[PDB]
Amino acid sequence: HMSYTWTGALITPCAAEESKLPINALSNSLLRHHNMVYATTSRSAGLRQKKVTFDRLQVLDDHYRDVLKEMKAKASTVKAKLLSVEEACKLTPPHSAKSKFGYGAKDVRNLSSKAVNHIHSVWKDLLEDTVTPIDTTIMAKNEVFCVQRKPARLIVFPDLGVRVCEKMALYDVVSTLPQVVMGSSYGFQYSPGQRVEFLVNTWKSKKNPMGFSYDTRCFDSTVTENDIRVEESIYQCCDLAPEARQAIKSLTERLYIGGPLTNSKGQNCGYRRCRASGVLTTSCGNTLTCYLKASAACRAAKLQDCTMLVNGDDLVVICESAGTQEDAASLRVFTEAMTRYSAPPGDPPQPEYDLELITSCSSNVSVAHDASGKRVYYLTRDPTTPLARAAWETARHTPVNSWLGNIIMYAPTLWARMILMTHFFSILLAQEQLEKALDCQIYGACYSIEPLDLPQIIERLHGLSAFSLHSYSPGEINRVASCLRKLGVPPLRVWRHRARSVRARLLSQGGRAATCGKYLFNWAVKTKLKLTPIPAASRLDLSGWFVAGYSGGDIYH
Numbered sequence: 001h002m003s004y005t006w007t008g009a010l011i012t013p014c015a016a017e018e019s020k021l022p023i024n025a026l027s028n029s030l031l032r033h034h035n036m037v038y039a040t041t042s043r044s045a046g047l048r049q050k051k052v053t054f055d056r057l058q059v060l061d062d063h064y065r066d067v068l069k070e071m072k073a074k075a076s077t078v079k080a081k082l083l084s085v086e087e088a089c090k091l092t093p094p095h096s097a098k099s100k101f102g103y104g105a106k107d108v109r110n111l112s113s114k115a116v117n118h119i120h121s122v123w124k125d126l127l128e129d130t131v132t133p134i135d136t137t138i139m140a141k142n143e144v145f146c147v148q149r150k151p152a153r154l155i156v157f158p159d160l161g162v163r164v165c166e167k168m169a170l171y172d173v174v175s176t177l178p179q180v181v182m183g184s185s186y187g188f189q190y191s192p193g194q195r196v197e198f199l200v201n202t203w204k205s206k207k208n209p210m211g212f213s214y215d216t217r218c219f220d221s222t223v224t225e226n227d228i229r230v231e232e233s234i235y236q237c238c239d240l241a242p243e244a245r246q247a248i249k250s251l252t253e254r255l256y257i258g259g260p261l262t263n264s265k266g267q268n269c270g271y272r273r274c275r276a277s278g279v280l281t282t283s284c285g286n287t288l289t290c291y292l293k294a295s296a297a298c299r300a301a302k303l304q305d306c307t308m309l310v311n312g313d314d315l316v317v318i319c320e321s322a323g324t325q326e327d328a329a330s331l332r333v334f335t336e337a338m339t340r341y342s343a344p345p346g347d348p349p350q351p352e353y354d355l356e357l358i359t360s361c362s363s364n365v366s367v368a369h370d371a372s373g374k375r376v377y378y379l380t381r382d383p384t385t386p387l388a389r390a391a392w393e394t395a396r397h398t399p400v401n402s403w404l405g406n407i408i409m410y411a412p413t414l415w416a417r418m419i420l421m422t423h424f425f426s427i428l429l430a431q432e433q434l435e436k437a438l439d440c441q442i443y444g445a446c447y448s449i450e451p452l453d454l455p456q457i458i459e460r461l462h463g464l465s466a467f468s469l470h471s472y473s474p475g476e477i478n479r480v481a482s483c484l485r486k487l488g489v490p491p492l493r494v495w496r497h498r499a500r501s502v503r504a505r506l507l508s509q510g511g512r513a514a515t516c517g518k519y520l521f522n523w524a525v526k527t528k529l530k531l532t533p534i535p536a537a538s539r540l541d542l543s544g545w546f547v548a549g550y551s552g553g554d555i556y557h
């Protein structure tokens with residue numbers, strides 16, 4: 001019952017890869033310790049192969065089947081529509097991997113007769129054949145980190161024509177079903193502020209709260225054929241068109257359960273019998289299966305008044321404490337149950353009794369004060385990976401701008417405001433690129449975003465307090481300070497100078513730019529403005545944001 005079998009062929013890149021941080025004239029203004037930053041490449045894909053390859057055993061008990069029954073009952077309430085080919089085409093990212101059959105993502109998006117003709121042929125084949133394994137491409141992701149080196153993560157995805165077919169069959173399902181099945185436990189329905197609100201209210205609702213995060217080792221590889229068939233059984237609970245049911249069955253049998261792995265050179269690399277990291281159902285499948293196994297494990301561990309929050313393979317549980325020694329014992333029983341269900345731990349879960357100390361979705365709740373001095377909870381994270389990626393993005397244009405996603409999602413944080421906004425607005429000003437729409441990713445989906453809209457986006461997501469936070473917590477200050485020393489990032493003195501410069505220039509341009517200056521950088525002046533609601537912010541169409549997760553799923557807006 002191995003997760004993968006391999007032929008020995010390499011996982012190959014498509015283009016020249018870089019691992020060392022490129023340096024340009026701007027690099028040192030952000031970070032001096034350049035040797036701390038690296039990108040993963042296909043060179044390390046061999047180590048990853050070793051890591052992801054193991055035997056899965058699964059022993060499924062009555063808690064598991066009880067939870068599944070309840071999940072199916074809720075799923076039976078969902079009605080999902082089939083997308084037209086052209087609706088599905090318009091969801092495709094413009095820089096999505098080209099088809100092997102002589103068209104690309106922009107062909108798809110333009111509804112080119114060639115792409116559309118092929119997509120219809122793939123659809124027909126899905127309805128007619130529910131057995132033949134579908135080919136997938138395997139590639140090493142190029143992602144940037146700070147040292148202490150990780151091997152490249154792998155992405156496995158079918159041809160572009162199949163990906164459009166997945167949207168047709170399942171886009172409505174994966175967008176709608178998880179919230180119905182898991183209600184408030186479904187993480188991707190929340191903006192950062194809403195996630196914080198959910199966590200704080202949940203923490204406060206317990207008499208003696210305890211929480212933990214559970215890290216499954218290599219979650220995709222722990223996902224078994226059983227798990228994937230179970231996911232399919234849940235999808236089929238929905239009220240679907242006959243054609244959708246057939247396509248979902250076909251895609252499950254032919255793609256989701258497993259299939260051959262081909263490198264970018266076209267050599268057979270092996271065979272997958274676990275979750276594909278690059279299909280539409282990656283996020284929704286992982287979320288459901290994690291929720292299923294975790295809910296069942298909660299019952300096995302007899303955890304009292306459990307509240308779960310689940311985002312794909314990321315899991316937080318807040319429950320009633322039975323004291324430290326008992327909580328430790330319960331978590332060990334929880335871990336044992338997860339292991340039996342084929343979700344063994346990476347790091348063993350630790351009980352926490354301070355909400356700020358629980359890290360989930362790489363983030364934690366923290367506290368600061370707004371302009372009136374009121375305490376405000378907000379979501380933050382360790383800044384090391386954001387700053388390392390920002391450094392890469394200072395020297396190189398990347399298909400997804402992590403800095404922009406980080407500003408959007410972490411707008412209220414000390415580090416996003418002091419460093420990311422200051423640094424990148426400086427660059428955008430200098431290059432006259434304030435009005436150029438850039439791509440970023442939110443919950444796996446790709447969005448095109450004009451930097452000049454950032455104040456309205458921030459006000460809408462986080463509220464005006466995001467432009468006024470101060471008196472951050474000692475833990476947060478310590479972490480940010482420690483990160484800046486580690487990476488050799490300049491001090492507040494420097495960033496405050498740059499922010500005032502950036503601000504003054506933005507005000508001069510007028511219009512949306514001045515609004516950027518006024519709102520984003522009010523923190524940098526001695527005589528602060530009183531920031532008022534931005535009229536234009538009421539007229540932003542933020543539909544599609546914070547509905548669902550689409551990691552690996554090839555979704556654009």
Ligand SMILES: CC(C)N(c1cc(-c2ccccc2)sc1C(=O)O)C(=O)[C@H]1CC[C@H](C)CC1
Nearest residue numbers: 414417418469470471472473477480481492523
């Ligand atoms: C106290 C004051 C000087 N201060 C401050 C500096 C901190 C800082 C901590 C570590 C490293 C660098 C700066 S924290 C901290 C705060 O108010 O909590 C501030 O005015 C910030 C300045 C940066 C603003 C984005 C947010 C408001």
